[PDB]
Amino acid sequence: MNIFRLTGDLSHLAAIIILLLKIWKSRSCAGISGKSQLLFALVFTTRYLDLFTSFISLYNTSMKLIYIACSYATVYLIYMKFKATYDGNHDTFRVEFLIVPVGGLSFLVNHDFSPLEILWTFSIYLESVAILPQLFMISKTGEAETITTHYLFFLGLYRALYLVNWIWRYYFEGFFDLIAVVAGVVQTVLYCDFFYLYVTKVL
Ligand SMILES: CCCCCCCC/C=C\CCCCCCCC(=O)OC[C@H](O)CO
Ligand SMILES: CCCCCCCC/C=C\CCCCCCCC(=O)OC[C@H](O)CO
Numbered sequence: 071m072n073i074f075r076l077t078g079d080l081s082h083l084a085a086i087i088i089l090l091l092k093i094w095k096s097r098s099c100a101g102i103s104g105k106s107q108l109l110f111a112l113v114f115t116t117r118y119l120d121l122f123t124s125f126i127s128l129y130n131t132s133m134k135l136i137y138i139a140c141s142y143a144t145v146y147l148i149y150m151k152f153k154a155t156y157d158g159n160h161d162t163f164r165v166e167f168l169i170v171p172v173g174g175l176s177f178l179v180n181h182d183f184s185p186l187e188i189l190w191t192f193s194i195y196l197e198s199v200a201i202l203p204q205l206f207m208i209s210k211t212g213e214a215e216t217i218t219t220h221y222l223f224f225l226g227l228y229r230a231l232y233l234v235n236w237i238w239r240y241y242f243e244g245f246f247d248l249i250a251v252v253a254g255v256v257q258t259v260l261y262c263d264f265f266y267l268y269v270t271k272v273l
Contacts, residue, residue, distance in 0.1 A: 072239065075239075101211070113196050113197045119186060123186065165203060176189075195253055197253070199256065199260065201261060205267060209267060222265055229257065
């Protein structure tokens, strides 16, 4: 554990809280793709399955439980409460063409053919493309009412801090993860497309 994975996770957490609090106060999830939020909740579900097998630290367990509870609550706030503001007519990305290749990719490319390692690799590959339904929604409508600039800021700071996390990890520990780094580059390119679409079409 280093400071850039630490702050990157906190930056990742800050954005999730911003979106969860924005939907709650505005009583609205218009412009948000619940399919994307469902995928990010599936990411935390398959990434943190090690809670039923391995308790590492109180901080480590709390972050997992907070990540899971926060994105689960966002999904509840989109599909049950405030569902009258869910723009389901535009959140129409056929995500089966996404989880099936990602699932097959995690089945074939992993660090170990172990159940928990396969589902961790799935979460890493799924998290890299989970933003695709939301990008499909924004490009179609050109609108994203619930999306605020500072929500993007902590999304970019999160990916940018994991950029430093990869570098500090290699130079000070000799650790390098081809699977996570490659998927992270895919996630970063798509997240810049998120930021570019917001500036050019929304803001
Ligand atoms: C058990 C041991 C665990 C060890 C874990 C160690 C984690 C790294 C901690 C401190 C290094 C701080 C490095 C200095 C950071 C400087 C930041 C900086 O230069 O920022 C530039 C700024 O953004 C405009 O230039
Ligand atoms: C109005 C319509 C708005 C649509 C707005 C775009 C929606 C994105 C949909 C499809 C892009 C195809 C998927 C592109 C990203 C997946 C490809 C990928 O990451 O492949 C892995 C890499 O290329 C190998 O290492």
